[PDB]
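We modelled each protein-ligand pair independently. The example shown here corresponds to the 77K entry; the chain sequence is given first, followed by the ligand as SMILES.
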Amino acid sequence: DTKEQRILRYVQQNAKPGDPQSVLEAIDTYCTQKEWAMNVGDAKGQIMDAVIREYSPSLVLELGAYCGYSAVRMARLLQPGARLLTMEMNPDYAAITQQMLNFAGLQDKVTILNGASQDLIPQLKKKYDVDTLDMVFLDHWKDRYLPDTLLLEKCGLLRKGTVLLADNVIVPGTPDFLAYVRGSSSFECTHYSSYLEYMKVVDGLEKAIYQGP
Ligand SMILES: Cn1cnc(CNC(=O)c2cc(-c3ccc(F)cc3)cc(O)c2O)c1
Ligand SMILES: [Cl-]
Ligand SMILES: [Cl-]
Ligand SMILES: [Cl-]
Ligand SMILES: [Mg+2]
């Protein structure tokens, strides 16, 4: 089997069904003790939690679900009725993410879409009945952060106050995105320094709040 299958199985056998916190703890334990994986992790996860709680977004888009760690993290803190859409281009990972959400009991709050974000973003308004997004979590291929941000704007999915939160702006880094948002009058940016998941290596999140045209 794959690392991702092994992570899912560990959760199923070491967490309590319907208990998202136990799911996060199980993944963190597995990835610290057994096999590293590119989940956002606890250090950066705590920063994400603080941001989610500050904004209480009604509609969140995540780019890059992977195994669903961040989707569980965010969805567990959403208010009743609030929703998460998460995109994952790898079908095997999309299936892991669905099963992870199912186990966590969060499947009614989250929709996991299998496809490249550049292909799905233009369908959000008509197919998924989206008006604008309250928050976007970027965690997919690092060279897609900038083009997909520009695509979100083109498609009319950003509003004044839409919070972009980007993982991995130090490692692996996303230099074009980071330069762009920090240099743009349409974004107000804040850097949250942290650590790479499960590693004593500096990383960070960037929050970029959209200001309109
Ligand atoms: C498999 N996959 C398909 N798309 C993606 C998008 N994400 C990343 O590439 C990603 C990578 C790293 C990372 C990898 C190696 C390393 F040495 C240090 C950091 C960490 C993350 O948090 C990430 O999100 C991953
Ligand atoms: Cl994650
Ligand atoms: Cl993608
Ligand atoms: Cl961590
Ligand atoms: Mg990441």
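The first strand starts at residue 59 and ends at 63.
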